[PDB]
Amino acid sequence: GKSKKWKEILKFPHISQCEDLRRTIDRDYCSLCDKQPIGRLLFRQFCETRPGLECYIQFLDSVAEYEVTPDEKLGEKGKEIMTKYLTPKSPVFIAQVGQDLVSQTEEKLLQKPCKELFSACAQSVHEYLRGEPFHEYLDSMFFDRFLQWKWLERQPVTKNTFRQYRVLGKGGFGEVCACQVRATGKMYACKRLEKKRIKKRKGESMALNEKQILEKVNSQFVVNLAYAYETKDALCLVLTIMNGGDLKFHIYNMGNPGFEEERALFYAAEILCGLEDLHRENTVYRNLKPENILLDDYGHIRISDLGLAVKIPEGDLIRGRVGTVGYMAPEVLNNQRYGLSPDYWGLGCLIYEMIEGQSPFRGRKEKVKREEVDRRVLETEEVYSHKFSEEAKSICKMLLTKDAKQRLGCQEEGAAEVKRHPFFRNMNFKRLEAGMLDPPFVPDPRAVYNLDHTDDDFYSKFSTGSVSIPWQNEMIETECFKELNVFGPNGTLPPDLNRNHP
């Protein structure tokens, strides 16, 4: 439901308005041609207007398919790529990969196939595009078109930008609404934080901590920040909407009490990927519990509620007795200095709870006081059942190792050590990260599962506006980019991109 005049709101400015952008946007190849969704498409569209560059984009696409191809189908896919792109007589032959690299990857196919067989070549491809072609694109109309899209992206985000609908629950420091962008019609979840309730509790730094952590991480398995803006009496965080219900609901109301191992495997795998993306920013979630794992319309999960998350200064540890009773790792209960390790304890708690239908330290039918739950977490050894395979028992107690130094994933290798565990022996994480694995459960779309100045300065740092990557993804999902990104007939400069007549 895009506003009747959405084409006027997203109307491209004249290229002459973007001059200040042209000389401030850093010209990084990976940023303008890969990370940024709309730049990526534009550069790919530039290469589509040249004969020599065309085959280089097609080859990268086919290598992407190779990586997610099933194992038994890998030798077949590999041969096709070579006969098509790496044959000297092919019409779309890749040339910058020297003859001493096509004759090399030929041997990898003469042997067993690996999912990274073409990773060597693909890099040689990007090394060529980073050079001449990238600098030609920079002086093409497609980059001028990119500058226009950036100009729109940086437009101020007000309250008429959105359209509030309902209250999707609530929590502390505010409530969560469901909002829609009038111009594109995309649904988000607005996290409205009462302005006067923040100053009173004196928790200003905790509000920026969450906003800054959300905008810096872009993961398929963590709620993504798309906008942040101030308003009268509230500060808002526009986040990914999740209509599939939380994991606590599905463990207890909709599962046995619990799930099958294979089903928990899927959710555990996605949660482990979420945590890995956070850890790449040396950030700890510290708040793993079933009700913070939400499900979307398709059955995939995202971590939510980064309010207790913090960015660890690299090479340093932190202190903080924070979390929920029963989901706090020993180092946290003891108020020790820890790193990322609480998040791998929490992953243990979830795999266990998913499979058994109760916490590993408190029964579903047990009346127990907090202190006894903490004692257990610190001293007692959890017990497993026939619901767990030996592999499942292993990863759970490895992750529930009370000594954070001996705990799985709490080493130099990190999440990779956990993905290698026999528990995920049958989980192809590459196909998972690409969304190609069907979720186990699919929700139904119809279900129901005061005038100071120091405060002014605190708002400017928070109300940064739209987030770059999520905003561009919004333009693409709603097909606003497909509709507005129109050039002139037969490779002609459209009026907006021609400096002769504004």
Ligand SMILES: Cc1[nH]c(/C=C2\C(=O)N=C3CC=C(C(=O)N[C@H](C)c4ccccc4)C=C32)c(C)c1C(=O)NCCN(C)C
């Ligand atoms: C659709 C929907 N969204 C959500 C919720 C979310 C979401 O989607 N994204 C996000 C991202 C981040 C949070 C988050 O920080 N929270 C914490 C606790 C919080 C902290 C401070 C203030 C308020 C809240 C929540 C959400 C819920 C429950 C339903 C829901 O289940 N509503 C009942 C009927 N539904 C089936 C339609």
